[PDB]
Amino acid sequence: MPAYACQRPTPLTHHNTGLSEALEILAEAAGFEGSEGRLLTFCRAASVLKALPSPVTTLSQLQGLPHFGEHSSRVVQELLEHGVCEEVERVRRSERYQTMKLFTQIFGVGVKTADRWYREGLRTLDDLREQPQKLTQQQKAGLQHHQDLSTPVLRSDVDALQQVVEEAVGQALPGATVTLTGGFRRGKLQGHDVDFLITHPKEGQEAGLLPRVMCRLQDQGLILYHFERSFCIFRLPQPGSWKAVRVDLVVAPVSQFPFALLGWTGSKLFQRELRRFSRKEKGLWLNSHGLFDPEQKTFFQAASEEDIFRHLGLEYLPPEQRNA
Template sequence: MSLVPQKRSRPSLPVGPTRDGMESTKFPDIGLFLVERKMGSSRRSFLTALARRKGFCVEEAYSERVTHVIAEHNSGAEVMQWLVGQPAKREEGRSPILLHISWFTECMAAGEPVKIEPRHLLEVQMHSDVAVSSLVATYGCLRRTPLTNRNHVFTDALETLAKEAAFCGSEGRSLAFIRAASVLRSLPSTLTTMEELSRMPGFGEHSKRVVQEILEDGSSAEVERVTQEERYQTMKLFTNIFGVGIKTANKWYQEGLRSIGDLRNSQKKLKLTKQQETGLQHYEDLTMPVSHTEADLIAKMVEEVAHRFLPGTIITLAGGFRRGKLSGHDVDILITHPQEGREEGLLSKVISQLQSQGLILYHSLKRNSYYDASSPGGKSTSSMDHFEGSFSIFKLKGLSQSRDNGARVHSTDSGRDWKAVRVDLVVTPISQYPFALLGWTGSKHFERELRRFSSHEKKMVLNSHALYDTVQQTFLAATSEEDIFMHLGLEYIPPSDRNA
């Protein structure tokens, strides 16, 4: 069935210049209607004016002349429910196409109507698991994935196999398991049959076998075997140490080391880096979950010091906490200032002040290397993060006075009121802040999929600094995360739904 509505007779439209200087209507067979609900009147007015300048006919009210209904942050069911209540009568079989904002933004960029792809359509989902499963988007960045996971029994198994594959150096196999788990994590209901799985993207035969085994037997024999293996348990233990990667963990395993005690007893012989030495010293603290309250305390601590040196500094808690998680393993904080360039030199002052207060157990400063690259404009278009930053371990004090949801904030033992916490401080110029905020919010897989979509579908390079159009050979400016999604022709997905 064609996705383009058939031509039909319509009242004549102006063909010459309009009184207010807008372009004439170039596309008389298309009538756009922008749904104000969730879009807002100001944005709707702006987009209406933009479309008319491009030669599109935009109807102020829903009527029989409307061929394309454009919505933002609305589901197809919500739009249909709204349309049913409208007074306009339409001929049978003359229903408009329901589209989300991505089609509209692509039309504005092209200056003409673009082909309607399935990804542009606002599907009206039926109340059945099969109907929902058939609408799962291929890219993880196109799916809304809340924290609530109704398929954790499957995702836990697949993520275990992903970790084991990574320990064996098979990144491709690891990513395949991660993609399969990401699809299941996004589902609004629990998977119950293999028939539902057949309509979902991202599932190889291995992942399907694991899911089928769990559906039939309640568990996967392969996953059970992996979790009992000595190598898997040891690699998982060692890679949880701050500063220890897979290669180092594997080397220690090959040398016969199996526990934290083994590492501490062999510490001098191992010649640990300062980072690894500190990570081993505070291992128990650093593997203890960090609560949202503790993360807020650290952000407030950084903010107070930053404001002493530079009033107006913006401190943002990023990572999983920005996505709504109640706990995590570290704290990510972005630092910027409304005036471009004022943030330079601030980080070293903040770290020095916190050190003088005895609140830094370890830190490693990294300078900004963004403009060192030889790419267009002297800016890097790689996926690497080039921000000035500090990878630190903070000494969080006063835990006995702090409370999290009515309970005491975690303490490591009864003899002290502080704990070691992993903290990453990242400094970004305000012009790069929207990209940094997007990149450092995560999840890791959501960001990976967003970069993949940008490259494969839009011929653009996205990283935590910028969005580069390789066709037009230009960097696209953004003042918010919403701008970045709009450049990519995507519906904006809030942080709470980026837990892919």
């Protein structure tokens, strides 16, 4: 088992779902306390189990696996012996975990804001609604649309959304293209992360594109709430009605498109691990715009995601195997 998640295939569904979910509770709780190192370890340990070819049934089987030390091994041991890990269950039940999860789920609210509200004594969405002057415009929209945004959308909804975006993009700049990214590109059948990546085959033509796309979607009445990244809430048709959905639109020049496609396809852990691998193992600096050699002071050209994996000396993984 290689130590970096970008060195191994990770499918969307696997053989250790309950074990990984428990470790991810501890990772999430560590984030709510600002403990980013512990979050990463628990995320990495969970991801290792997603990559295994069969269920872990005995503690012996964790020997030698990267990111399994005393704490993560104890969690697994308790789940294997008793079906439940007391520490995980204590987290799940706690007022702190439940409230931090509720508040950070709001679009416009991060850990730092949620923690401050928690320390002020706030606990429910209606608590927040009773002091809207304490809210940014972004948080107001997140709160108003929270219920709809809490329900995932289906791939069929995604395909309907992509056609409306393509219509606006075609008027904004004929020849521009729209690519579905995020979790749907990794094979999800449902999810919240509806993301599109927009480019044009002629380098430079995409300059100024995103405002023109946004204006056209607004004129169509599709934008409930809203440069090169736009974080939107869209109206999605439903039988007899509609619902709010979070949609991100991103523009990249074609030269950068493989790097943006790679970054926006995820998973989050996969990208962090890829960037860590690049820098620490290869001495190259990776982001969603390019890959820099700091000794030559040159950027790699890439025409495909395959090029980027080759640059980094990694076997290619298709999107469906990037579910770290």
